[PDB]
Point group: C2
Chain length 83, copies 2
């Protein structure tokens, strides 16, 4: 395995289990709006749930940059404080 | 999930897939010698496979202490260099 796959595996289950997400549409490349059709409120709560999964606090400036599962996985894997 | 479980999951598969290990006996608490019947030569090769799974070079001072799956997971999870 790998650390990047470890991160992706947990982001996938956070996003699939979110109530406003149709899990059958989720891929490792899913964009939150352009692929999963989420609105602005859904994105904020999904990103927060991703934060809780990794026991991480992301400042709002970069939390707003997270708009897809690749963005979330790329960011979380690079964060050393991740858990 | 969790970071410690991510490490544990990959250590379990390294140990289970080792040729001198009976995979059916491996748990998160397996001791290499008293539970899996490995000798010191086997343990070194298991430690090396753990080094390659996580792209870590474990100094001999810390490799000698690794005698069980808890020993390996506690060490790897705490090491900031990891993959």
């Amino acid at each position: 395995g790998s650390h990047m796959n470890d991160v992706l595996t947990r982001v996938l289950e956070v996003v699939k289990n979110f109530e406003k997400v149709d899990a059958s549409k989720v891929t490792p490349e899913s964009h939150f709006v352009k692929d999963l059709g989420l609105n602005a409120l859904d994105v904020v709560e999904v990103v927060f749930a991703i934060e809780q999964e990794f026991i991480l606090d992301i400042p709002d400036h970069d939390a707003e940059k997270i708009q897809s599962i690749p963005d979330a996985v790329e960011y979380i894997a690079q964060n050393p404080m991740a858990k």
